[PDB]
Design a protein around this ligand. Structure first.
Ligand SMILES: O=C(O)[C@@H](Nc1ncnc2[nH]ccc12)c1ccc2c(c1)OCCO2
Length: 164
């Protein structure tokens, strides 16, 4: 059901799109959230997905944290997709602006291999402070399942495609 994606490899596809608008259109089985260890969906992709669920994602996430404690950096948990998807795979990539180890990004992408097809952002890019070109390279070299990447920024999308 995905459309207008550019094929990068056998299993990796990319599109200049708002992941919230893409999610409401496709209603995929899994939408990936660029989460932090506490599942506090304040800004970036996480704040945009949470706002699209009318804060239902935050309420569900606080109950998950109250029961299980925080995630590890490089880890993940599967929660409801609410009105956007069947499931939301909350993945924690290293936040360079918090001094976290960029080496954990490959461990972060390995979480995608547990799902046949996913709609996702570039992990650790944006407000997480990592080089998006490096994030796309780690993605293509780590994920074996079908991943459809949504890149919000037009200028960044062009840079990623032209330098791939
Ligand atoms: O367009 C994007 O998808 C991307 N923006 C940028 N990623 C890097 N340098 C950038 N320069 C200008 C925009 C930009 C992004 C924005 C928020 C994000 C995110 C990724 O993933 C994790 C947390 O929230």
């Amino acid at each position: 059901s995905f459309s207008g994606y550019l094929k990068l490899t056998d299993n990796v596809y990319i599109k200049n799109a708002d992941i919230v608008e893409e999610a409401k259109k496709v209603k995929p089985t899994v939408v990936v959230n660029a989460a932090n260890v506490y599942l506090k969906h304040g800004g970036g992709v996480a704040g945009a997905l949470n706002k699209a669920t009318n804060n239902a994602m935050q309420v569900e996430s606080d109950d998950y944290i109250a029961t299980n404690g925080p995630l590890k950096v490089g880890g993940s948990c599967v929660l409801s997709g609410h009105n956007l998807a069947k499931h939301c795979l909350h993945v924690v990539g290293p936040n360079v602006n918090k001094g976290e180890d960029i080496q954990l990004l490959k461990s972060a992408y390995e979480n995608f291999n547990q799902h046949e097809v996913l709609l996702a952002p570039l992990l650790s890019a944006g407000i997480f402070g990592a080089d998006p070109i490096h994030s796309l390279r780690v993605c293509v070299d780590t994920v074996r399942t079908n991943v459809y990447l949504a890149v919000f920024d037009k200028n960044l999308y062009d840079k990623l495609v032209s330098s791939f």
